[PDB]
Amino acid sequence: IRVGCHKLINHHIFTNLILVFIMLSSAALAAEDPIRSHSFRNTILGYFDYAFTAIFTVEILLKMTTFGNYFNLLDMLVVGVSLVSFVVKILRVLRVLRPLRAINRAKGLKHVVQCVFVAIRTIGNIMIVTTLLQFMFACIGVQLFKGKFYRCTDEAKSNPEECRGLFILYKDGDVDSPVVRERIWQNSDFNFDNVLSAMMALFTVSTFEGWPALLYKAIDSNGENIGPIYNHRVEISIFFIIYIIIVAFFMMNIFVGFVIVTFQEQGEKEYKNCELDKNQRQCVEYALKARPLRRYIPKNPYQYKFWYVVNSSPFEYMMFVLIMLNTLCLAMQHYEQSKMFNDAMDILNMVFTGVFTVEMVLKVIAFKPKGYFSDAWNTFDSLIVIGSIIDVALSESITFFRLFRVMRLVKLLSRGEGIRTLLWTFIKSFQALPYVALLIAMLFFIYAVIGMQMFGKVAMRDNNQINRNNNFQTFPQAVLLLFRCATGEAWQEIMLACLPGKLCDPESDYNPGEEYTCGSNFAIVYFISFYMLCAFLIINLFVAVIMDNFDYLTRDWSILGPHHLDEFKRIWSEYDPEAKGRIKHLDVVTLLRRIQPPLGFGKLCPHRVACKRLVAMNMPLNSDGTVMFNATLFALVRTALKIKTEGNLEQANEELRAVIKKIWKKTSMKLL
């Protein structure tokens, strides 16, 4: 009976258990020791994989019972490799396919992967053109600098027939500190010997890394098989300048521009402009998705005195001034300062923490502490002072609490109209697309694991790019190296440092006698592929985030926007102490007087135009002092946009129920 197996595989908890097991198995894979093959940690982790590879084995058979696509074959491939593993290095490398099994489970991951593949397909035209341009420039560079990059170990011999034997080296230019060194006639690490080398060198140049060194190496190039001369041909830099301008500045900015325009055109599928344009679709909706708020006005005027004292413009400006002063006093502590200077700093810090504690106690007294912590800003500054107030007696661990007092400046970032909303919009957009960054995370994971398995045995020295701070011996360190290469710091230098002829650290179980074996020719393709993939994925994520909130980026503040409606709501709340729906019509005239001309009425007499317009337009025939929040705000929105005549008012309801989303029975009184 293959229906119970179907119930089990389709059960609510089984899919989640499989997904968490997949991610746990990947985490176990990313915790193996790359150097010490005979290590205790790997033995425990190998035991973990035995159970993990059995659950994945018992679920493919269980799924196969009820069935008789290409993703299922991949799942069998991963399980097959583990069983066959039980040479072996290739299977170990192929073991990194564990995270790919989670693509078919999460819908968001599948969607973002499909979108990435579509983006790759639609942009293949530009890649071919720029590849052909790089090929042409590589051929030209081969013709220009074929074999001219050779140089001797000492800059005194300028041909191979002279670069033989030993020579005296003067360390650091000192004439009294000589040392004997060999003469080697060696080629450059990046040269233009054949087409492949030229393409690699031009790729490194186009990544804007290490290109000045190649430029000044090519300027000095004399001849076919002779050494360089200082500034032999400066005019040869025209080749590099032209290549950079054509490829890295033009053909790379056209890449991002094409991605941007493709995303913008694809997102313009909203062909519902039968009656409303983009502006109406952006403005009317905020009328529907609105909820009124109250002012939290307190009682007991004896307590309201402090509330009146605190909530004022002079108080806020004074606190601005003292926060700037505290920042200035914080950011003038130098090195080897005087004892009197340090004492003055301590006293001033005491004064500032005391005045901020006075602020806290006054605000908590005046602002009804039950709701004081409701706001995010008020809670944020409370943690700052509490951490700061405990350090006053500790001046005669502690360093962590010092950083708290720096954070008071962050509150000053939300004191401007536009810099706060820009941040709000982009962090909201980032939160709206969490699966796009998961592709970057998976790429980093896969490449870090491959780097562990390939270059994890390269010895760490002090004069090389594989040093104590930069190697593949640990997952945080491999990930840091990949992040550094993504930034493009010295990625080609590490790539060169990962070639086969490298010394191995004396901890791996290698064959005695041979120690210059670790490293592989896989390094070149590894690093080039990682750079290209990471650059493309970063561009894709950036453009997706930009396009997610594109209305704000093209807001056109002159016409209208949600800021006008928010100002309307905030000003209205002054005349509406509570959000209990219906409001009083007594001070509506003064309320509209307070509003800006784009939404309210201008500086002219309201009795001539505003009073006529308020009553002339159709309003719900409710009581004298009863009218809902929507019945006013949506009416004002419809007054501001696509004004009509009388008789066709029900066309608004028709548009709301047809073009706009479901009314959800909120327009029963809005029908009038």
Binding site: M136, Q143, F208, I546, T554
Partner: protein, 555 residues
């Protein structure tokens, strides 16, 4: 004064260009050295000063306009500089001469409007700049608090002031970081710093400079590793990784998004004028002419083969073989391959010229010169046929072999004719080539101005090491231009900044104030690049994308 408008304003512009050339020729020798060229150029500069004063006093009628304001400010500061030089940092007062090339934009309104548009497109980025300022200040204060004066302890020898290794790195501050363990080495304080004292967090200015260096993704790993050596190993990675992600990745997203949303505003506004229609109307009649030029002429005035399907693929095979022959040369190539290459070139040149003469005398001589696709093919064929006789005759030209292979290499483009997508963008690029050239010329002028300023400031001043010679200097105009380009691309600009700082003393003294030259050049130079090459792409890709929509629907 008297009416003199059309000859005067172009003669003065030629004078500006000549002054630019004269300023470019000057060589900034070190330590007050000179030659005859500067001796003549001082008198040339005198004559330019008198002519500028004469033409300024001629038109005074004038000061309220900003451009004329700068125009006479340059003249008066030059006069004061001449007076002070004769009556003797007086030589540095001539740095205002670098702004004379900027006067050339006032003489060309077509470029003045472009400069005005670029400048006006900067206001929306002020919020992002302010956010960057807060981020830099906050991270500078955090660095000052966390680690101040900790990168001051390298390992010297036993009872000596000589450092052990030639690339020193700090020891642990309190037994947590790197420990220098060599034959005889104990490490104590008294070290100057990693970059000579320029990269450290022991001051607010130093912290701000280090944070600005790290936020541009240039040398942040060096600072991270130095702090790993000096302080512990667990805190410093949190500081620098977060600073790079928030300070650079997030901000680069801020700028790119705002710029993209600004280009669309002007794209959807000029569209209402009908600019796309002008391109569409011009392109819509190009397909109506090709048919109305062959069909109307094919009646009474070899054409079966050239329009076949086998001929195109045969030509494709030939050009593939040409590319294979070109991309097979290498250092120490076998002696049997050179002869193969030089006979394949000859035979394939003969075959290509036979094909070209067949094509020319099969459809029409006057119907192919108009089209630009085949216009350079004749030049390529003529150059190829000229190269053979030139080489084989009594003209060796050893470098001439490598310059004539490029025109033969350009033949690969014969495969990219029938695309309908590449050519669609090329049409818009050729339509907007005038704006493209204007933007490129403005960028070139900006680079020239900053190269001249760098020549004036750091000319002949990088000779302070006495142990090595620097390659990225400002010694003469080509080298200054290359250095400015390198700083513009953002590759090792921090090294040039450190050299410029040391050229004016060191980390101490008032020499650090010159760091604003490289801070301004990077910020202002990179803004122009993102407003020139990105604007060319965006406003010429939406034009091509919209053409396809019109072309596909009309098809």
């Amino acid at each position: 004064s008297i009416v003199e408008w059309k000859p005067f304003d172009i003669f003065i512009l030629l004078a500006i260009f000549a002054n630019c050339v004269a300023l470019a020729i000057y060589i900034p020798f070190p330590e007050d050295d000179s030659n005859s060229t500067n001796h003549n150029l001082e008198k040339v500069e005198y004559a330019f000063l008198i002519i500028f004063t004469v033409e300024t006093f001629l038109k005074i009628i004038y000061v309220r306009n900003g451009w004329n304001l700068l125009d006479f400010v340059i003249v008066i500061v030059g006069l004061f500089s001449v007076i002070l030089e004769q009556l003797t940092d007086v030589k540095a007062l001539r740095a205002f001469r670098v702004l004379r090339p900027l006067r050339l934009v006032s003489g060309v309104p077509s470029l003045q409007v472009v400069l005005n548009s670029i400048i006006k497109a900067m206001v929306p980025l002020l919020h992002i700049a302010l956010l960057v300022l807060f981020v830099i200040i906050i991270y500078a204060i955090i660095g000052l608090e966390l680690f101040i004066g900790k990168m001051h302890k390298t390992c010297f020898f036993a009872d000596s002031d000589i450092v052990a290794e030639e690339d020193p790195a700090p020891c642990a501050f309190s037994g947590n970081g790197r420990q220098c363990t060599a034959n005889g080495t104990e490490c104590r304080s008294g070290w100057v710093g990693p970059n000579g004292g320029i990269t450290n967090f022991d001051n607010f200015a130093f912290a701000m400079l280090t944070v600005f260096q790290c936020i541009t993704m240039e040398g942040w790993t060096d600072v991270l590793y130095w702090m790993n050596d000096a302080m512990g190993f667990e805190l410093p990675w949190v500081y620098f990784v977060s600073l790079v992600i928030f300070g650079s990745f997030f901000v680069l997203n801020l700028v790119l998004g705002v710029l993209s949303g600004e280009f669309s505003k002007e794209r959807e506004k000029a569209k209402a004028r009908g600019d796309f229609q002008k391109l569409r109307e011009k392109q819509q009649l190009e397909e109506d002419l090709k048919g109305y030029l062959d069909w109307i002429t094919q009646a009474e005035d070899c054409r079966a083969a050239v329009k076949s399907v086998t001929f195109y693929w045969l030509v494709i095979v030939l050009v593939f073989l040409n590319t294979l022959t070109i991309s097979s040369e290498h250092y120490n190539q076998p002696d049997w391959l050179t002869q193969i290459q030089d006979i394949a070139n000859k035979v394939l040149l003969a075959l290509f010229t036979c094909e070209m003469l067949v094509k020319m005398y099969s459809l029409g001589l006057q119907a192919y010169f108009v089209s630009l696709f085949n216009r350079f093919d004749c030049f390529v064929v003529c150059g190829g046929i000229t190269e053979t006789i030139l080489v084989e005759l009594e003209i060796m030209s050893p470098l001439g072999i490598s310059v004539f292979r490029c025109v033969r290499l350009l033949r690969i483009f014969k495969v990219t004719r029938h695309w309908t997508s590449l050519s669609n963008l090329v049409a818009s690029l050729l339509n907007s080539m005038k704006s493209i050239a204007s933007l490129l010329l403005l960028l070139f002028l900006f680079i020239i101005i900053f190269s001249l300023l760098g020549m004036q400031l750091f000319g002949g001043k990088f000779n302070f090491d006495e142990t090595q010679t620097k390659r990225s200097t400002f010694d003469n105009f080509p080298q200054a231009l290359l250095t400015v380009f390198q700083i513009l691309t953002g590759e090792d600009w921090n090294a040039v900044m450190y050299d410029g700082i040391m050229a004016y003393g060191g980390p101490s003294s008032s020499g650090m104030i010159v760091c604003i030259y490289f801070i301004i050049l990077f910020i202002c130079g990179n803004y122009i690049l993102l407003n020139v090459f990105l604007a060319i792409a965006v406003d010429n890709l939406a034009d091509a994308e919209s053409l396809n929509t019109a072309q596909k629907e009309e098809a």
